């Protein structure tokens, strides 16, 4: 026999370790076959200037196409013949490259990764070949309402800030982008301490630490002169951006109220809140009996196609809200239920309801961690986000302090009397007037 709590405390702790330059080493052991080693660099889109707005994202197309040591397709051939997978993901705050690989393959794994980060053989040919590709990706991203809309959100809740730029970047910055510019970018932002070398699975921390090729370090200050925040707050703005295209079959709406940085007691309590509203799709098997009202109403009244609440967490900024796709004629009704669910939440939460969401949270936050890749990303990202802690067993505790009054008071900071960030890609003809969505965040009636 064994009980949830117990299991919790029994989980392999994460070992954080440092090289001389600030290279961060972490790892969670299991003595299992496969391993996912990763280098989680934290110089994202938000450091880009208007020109290099898509810089980083451009580097990512070159990351895997050559090192001075390993030319044209020498990287791929190497990974492949091992049976290892190599992925590169980029965010507005975090770039990361990782490898999935047999545990015995660390040797040439970690070498590869390291290599990748540092030496990237980038010829004029590869630059002009990537351009064309990027320009073609851009065109394809315009084919995705959800991606089109979420960008919009950011741009309008971040209007007038570095953070509001697409990670994909400006069309024509791809055309223009000087070859010299990727260098300065990399050179200036890939310098650890930023970087973290993380990993999970069957490895021994001891060896990870050692394996780390100590080749280049942080060429930066020893004092406060550096302390000028490169992470300067980004002004919060509640505006809407309404891009109406009656040509399109459905309507995407992303509505948000600015939120806490990555670390904050209010930041877990929020989650528990969204557990309650939940998320819903044409294909949920419960429909009408699902315990979250927006879902039930939706399910019942054919109100919407799909809807999800989110919590986007940045160091100085946060996007909170949900997002619903709904026929041209149902934009207002779903707005009404949603906002309605928010207000009800900060005034009438009931312990039952908050206790169910609570438990949902735990699961969502345990099940994610199933698999090697998962764990690795939590460990890597966790270190630039929340610093060098791994709050995994704490969570249950923190999640445990949750009370219906805690949930209520935390939700009221952020939603109540606050000014929304709303964007849509019409049929938005029926989308509520900004003032109407505004007055939706306080309770006279409705």
């Amino acid at each position: 026999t064994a009980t949830y709590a117990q299991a919790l405390q029994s989980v392999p702790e994460t070992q954080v370790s440092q090289l001389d330059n600030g290279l961060r080493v972490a790892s969670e052991q299991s003595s299992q076959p496969t391993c996912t080693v990763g280098v989680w660099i934290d110089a994202g889109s938000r450091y880009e200037s208007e020109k290099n707005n898509g810089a980083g994202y451009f580097v990512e197309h070159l990351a895997f196409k050559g090192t001075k040591n390993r030319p044209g397709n020498a990287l791929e051939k190497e990974v492949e013949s091992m049976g290892a997978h190599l992925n590169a993901y980029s965010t507005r705050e975090h770039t990361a490259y990782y490898i999935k690989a047999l545990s015995k393959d660390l040797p040439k794994a970690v070498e590869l990764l390291a290599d990748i980060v540092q030496n990237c053989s980038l010829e004029d040919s590869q630059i002009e070949k990537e351009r064309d590709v990027i320009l073609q990706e851009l065109q394809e991203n315009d084919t995705s309402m959800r991606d089109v809309v979420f960008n919009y959100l950011h741009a309008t809740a971040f209007q007038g800030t570095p953070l509001a730029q697409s990670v994909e970047g400006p069309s024509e910055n791809v055309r223009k982008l000087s070859r010299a510019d990727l260098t300065e970018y990399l050179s200036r932002h890939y310098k650890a301490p930023r970087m973290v070398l993380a990993a999970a699975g069957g490895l021994e921390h001891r060896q990870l630490l050692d394996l780390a090729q100590k080749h280049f370090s942080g060429l930066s200050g020893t004092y406060d002169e550096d302390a000028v925040p490169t992470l300067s707050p980004c002004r919060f703005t509640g505006s809407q951006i309404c891009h109406r295209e009656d040509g399109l079959p459905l309507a995407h709406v992303a509505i948000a109220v600015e939120g806490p940085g990555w670390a904050h007691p209010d930041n877990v309590a929020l989650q528990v809140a969204n557990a309650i509203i939940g998320h819903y799709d044409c294909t949920y098997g419960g429909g009408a009996h699902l315990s979250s009202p927006l879902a039930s109403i939706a399910a019942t009244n054919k109100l919407c196609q799909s809807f999800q609440t989110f919590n986007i967490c940045y160091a100085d900024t946060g996007l909170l809200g949900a997002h619903f796709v709904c026929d041209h004629m149902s934009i207002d009704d779903m707005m009404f239920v949603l906002q309605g669910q928010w207000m009800r939440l900060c005034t009438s939460a009931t312990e039952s309801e908050v206790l169910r969401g609570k438990n949902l949270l735990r699961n969502a936050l345990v099940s994610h961690l199933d698999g090697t890749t998962p764990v690795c990303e939590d460990i890597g990202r966790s270190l630039l986000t929340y610093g060098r802690r791994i709050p995994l067993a704490e969570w249950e505790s923190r999640i445990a302090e949750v009370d219906a009054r805690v949930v209520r008071e935390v939700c009221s900071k952020y939603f109540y009397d606050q000014c929304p960030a709303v964007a849509g890609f019409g049929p938005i003809e029926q989308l509520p007037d900004y003032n109407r969505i505004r007055s939706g965040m306080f309770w006279l009636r409705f």
Binding site: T347, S348, A349, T350, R408
Partner: peptide, 22 residues
């Protein structure tokens, strides 16, 4: 829940209203 404290300030408003207004 919040209804007592809200019903109590709604209570008060009516009262002060009458009192004054009347």
């Amino acid at each position: 829940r919040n209804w007592v404290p809200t019903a109590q300030l709604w209570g008060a408003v009516g009262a002060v209203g009458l009192v004054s207004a009347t």
